[PDB]
């Protein structure tokens, strides 16, 4: 039987939770696997809707409401029918126990409403054109099973009744889980691939002693040195880096300490920062070449400059790149000046202090990035420390608050939304399940206004005028660092299964990672070898 070798998610001990609404804390094979969405949309090619559990939707001219059609004929893992009940109770389920929304639907979304059994009905808040990709983000649970328990926001859901390709939980340790085949999978004349095999991994070195070993199928971690440590090792050891996302230094606005809170919350402290950064250094060495200077103070890319309002990324390109100098004399002019005689800046109201920056623990070219900014900061005057958290504890500190500086990378959409939206609506910055890209807690009604009004009516240039609002607003005030646009890591090999996506054959965001969807549709193309 064929076994699919995959790697999500970084693990010291598996904890058996299937529970699709608790991304903090379960299992990253139960998003799509187990629980199959109502579209996957195709982020790599112009967010072009593949239906799956869902047969079509439609929008109204009001952009107030939405219909989804669901499909006739499918089951869940246990012979029960999959019905428009299903996706009308989990829209309730989060909309009642708001910990468990994860995207922010509740703020689309006013209620679910259903026509037939096979039609759902979404009332909106706000003109949204883009609410059908919001819905899909929605997980979808047997109601048959959900709905006597009596606290769904601590269920470990540990037997799993899904509507996805592989819910049989055939083996479970803490250092190995196998994820077998739906029994009754609508769709599994389509599928080729048997079980999911997930072992445990920590970190980034330990994952590197078994890839390099071609004891993995498809994973999606940074490895250093690819082409000397990997693909040296094999001729059927490949890989292909698309293009993704932003990474940059987010601080904290809301920041608890006198004196860096006073730091934090200067824009000429945070532009002195920015400049202090050597970004293509970063790239070469911490990444070995994978990626793209990011000297858009607004974040944009380099990806989307067809949507950048070049006259705004001029004005504050100068203080997103390498100026060790300009970041100098910037301090100088602002007042941040060193007046107890250590060689570090310290506040206009004179104290001291030193800026903690986290990246999470195992994520080495995260880890790398951030020593280096740690002495390129030390040049300018800027005293700073890494550190090297678990990302659980990275990840609460950004939630509650309590960080100076986190390094990290967003998710890399159709269009610039996915980026601003997540990284800038302070909508998200509140909320038990909310993400951590938000939590920098610098809140601009106006910044919220315009992403709101992204997708209120549908004509190509408004939009376009609406990003030029936001990218100006973001700009002027840097309110994060960013740094570069980076790559979606993605390695597979072909000795045990053939079918994968790659440069020759791009299908989709290729990555193995819980939160790209496209996944669904790239283990479909999976098959074995001999
Ligand atoms: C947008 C986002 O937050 N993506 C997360 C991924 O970055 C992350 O993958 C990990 O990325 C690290 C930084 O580049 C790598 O060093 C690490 O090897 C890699 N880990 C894996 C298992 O691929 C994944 C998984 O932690 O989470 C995403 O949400
Ligand atoms: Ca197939
Ligand atoms: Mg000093």
């Not at 428009?84 to 989060?94: E, I, K, P, Q």
């Not at 939980?169 to 803490?174: G, K, R, Y």
């Not at 950064?277 to 380099?302: C, E, K, W």
Request: glycine share 6%; hydrophobic share 35%.
């Amino acid at each position: 039987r064929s076994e699919l070798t995959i790697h999500p998610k970084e693990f010291t001990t598996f904890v058996r939770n299937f529970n699709p609404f608790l991304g903090a804390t379960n299992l990253h094979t139960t998003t799509d696997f187990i629980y199959e969405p109502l579209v996957v949309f195709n982020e790599m090619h112009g967010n072009t809707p593949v239906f799956r559990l869902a047969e079509n939707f439609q929008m109204s001219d009001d952009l107030m409401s939405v219909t989804f059609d669901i499909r006739k004929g499918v089951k869940w893992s246990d012979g029960e029918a999959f019905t428009a009940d299903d996706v009308v109770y989990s829209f309730n389920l989060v909309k009642e126990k708001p910990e468990l929304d994860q995207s922010g639907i509740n703020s689309w979304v006013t209620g679910v409403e259903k026509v037939n059994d096979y039609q759902v009905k979404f009332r909106l808040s706000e003109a949204n054109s883009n609410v059908p990709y919001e819905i899909a983000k929605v997980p979808v649970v047997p109601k048959h099973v959900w709905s006597k328990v009596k606290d769904p926001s601590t269920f470990t859901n540990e037997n799993p009744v899904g509507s996805g390709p592989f819910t049989v939980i055939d083996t479970f340790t803490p250092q190995l889980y196998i994820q077998c085949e739906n029994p009754n999978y609508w769709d599994a004349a389509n599928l080729d691939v048997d079980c999911l095999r997930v072992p445990q991994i920590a970190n980034n070195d330990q994952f590197l002693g078994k890839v390099v070993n071609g004891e993995m199928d498809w994973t999606s971690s940074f490895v250093p040195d690819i082409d000397r440590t990997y693909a040296a090792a094999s001729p059927k050891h490949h890989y292909w880096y698309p293009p993704a996302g932003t990474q940059a230094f987010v601080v904290n606005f809301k920041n608890p300490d006198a004196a860096k809170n006073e730091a934090l919350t200067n824009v000429d402290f945070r532009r002195a920062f920015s400049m202090a950064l050597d970004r293509q250094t970063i790239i070469d060495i911490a990444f070995y070449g994978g990626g793209t200077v990011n000297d858009f103070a607004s974040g944009l890319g380099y990806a989307f400059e067809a949507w950048s309002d070049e006259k705004t990324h001029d004005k504050f390109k100068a203080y997103n790149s390498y100026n060790a100098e300009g970041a100098k004399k910037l301090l100088a002019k602002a007042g941040f000046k060193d007046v107890n005689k250590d060689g570090f800046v310290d506040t206009p109201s004179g104290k001291s202090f030193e800026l903690l920056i986290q990246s999470p623990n195992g994520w080495t070219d995260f880890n790398n990035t951030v020593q280096l900014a740690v002495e390129q900061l030390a040049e300018v005057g800027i005293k700073a420390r890494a550190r090297t958290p678990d990302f659980s504890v990275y990840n609460q500190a950004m939630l509650e608050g309590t960080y100076d500086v986190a390094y990290t990378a967003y998710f890399h959409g159709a269009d610039p939304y996915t980026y601003w939206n997540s990284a800038y609506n302070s909508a998200l910055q509140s909320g038990d399940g909310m993400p951590r890209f938000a939590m920098h807690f610098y809140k601009n009604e106006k910044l919220d206004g315009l992403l709101n009004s992204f997708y209120k009516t549908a004509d190509k240039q408004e939009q376009l005028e609406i990003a030029h609002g936001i990218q100006q607003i973001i700009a002027q005030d840097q309110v994060t660092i960013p740094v570069l646009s980076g790559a979606y890591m993605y390695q597979y090999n072909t000795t045990r299964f053939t079918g994968w996506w790659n440069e020759e054959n791009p299908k989709g965001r290729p990555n193995i990672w819980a939160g790209i969807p496209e996944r669904l549709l790239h283990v479909l193309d999976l098959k074995p070898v001999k």
